[PDB]
Scaffold this active site. Structure first.
Site, PDB file in Angstrom:
ATOM      1  CG  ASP A   8      -1.786   1.257   1.416  1.00 17.07           C
ATOM      2  OD1 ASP A   8      -1.589   2.276   0.687  1.00 17.07           O
ATOM      3  OD2 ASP A   8      -2.641   1.242   2.367  1.00 17.07           O
ATOM      4  CG  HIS A  44      -2.268   3.805   4.287  1.00 14.85           C
ATOM      5  ND1 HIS A  44      -2.763   4.887   3.588  1.00 14.85           N
ATOM      6  CD2 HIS A  44      -3.331   3.258   4.923  1.00 14.85           C
ATOM      7  CE1 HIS A  44      -4.064   4.990   3.797  1.00 14.85           C
ATOM      8  NE2 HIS A  44      -4.433   4.011   4.603  1.00 14.85           N
TER       9      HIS A  44
HETATM   10 CA   LIG Z   1      -4.365   0.794   4.292  1.00 12.53          CA
END
Ligand SMILES: [Ca+2]
Ligand SMILES: [Ca+2]
Ligand SMILES: [Ca+2]
Ligand SMILES: [Cl-]
Lengths: 84, 96
Positions: free
Chosen positions: B55, B58
């Protein structure tokens, strides 16, 4: 700087076969330019299907002899600062 | 102009430096982005029963159970620590 992260998988089974990074290209993004992959939202963010017309444009930067008949190849465009 | 694009998102770990999650292997990436053509970098572990995906907003690995795609929460590639718990709403069944 920029490294192309090349990854490939056996067509029959889907099993992982190999990974190789290009040498660093620094802040020169023109390799991406020549694959028609826009900088926007694509640097550090996902692998791309290596299609037939991309093979001659990438083969120079890799030791692995890219055989799209045998394996599914993916490249991703990874960027970190400096020598990494 | 480029290298600002570099800093747009969090760069992914190299396969060798993903600590404390078992031995890992890239798996064919299948999870698509919306604003890109990228599919998400994917690794499998525990003989293919666990799936981790990067991800890049993030800066964390999202983990999942291969059998049904269930979310296991997110993990920190440097240490293998669980950073967020499993979210029952979430799964990757459609991109296995
Ligand atoms: Ca996430
Ligand atoms: Ca052949
Ligand atoms: Ca994926
Ligand atoms: Cl090298």
């Amino acid at each position: 700087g920029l490294k192309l992260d090349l990854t490939w998988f056996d067509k029959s089974t889907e099993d992982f076969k190999g990974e190789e990074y290009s040498k660093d290209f620094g802040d020169d993004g023109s390799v991406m330019e020549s694959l028609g992959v826009p900088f926007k939202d694509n640097v550090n963010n996902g692998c791309f299907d290596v299609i037939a017309e991309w093979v001659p444009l990438l083969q120079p930067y890799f030791n692995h002899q890219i055989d799209i008949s045998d394996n599914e190849y993916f490249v991703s465009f990874d960027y970190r600062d400096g020598d990494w | 102009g480029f290298k600002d694009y570099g800093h747009d998102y969090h760069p992914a770990p190299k396969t060798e430096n993903i600590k404390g999650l078992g031995d890992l292997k890239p798996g064919i990436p299948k999870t698509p982005k919306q604003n890109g053509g990228g599919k998400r970098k994917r690794w499998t572990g525990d003989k293919g029963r666990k799936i981790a995906e990067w991800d890049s907003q993030h800066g964390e690995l999202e983990g999942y159970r291969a059998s049904d795609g269930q979310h296991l929460g997110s993990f920190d590639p440097k240490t293998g620590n669980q950073l967020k718990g499993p979210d029952p709403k979430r799964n990757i069944k459609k991109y296995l």
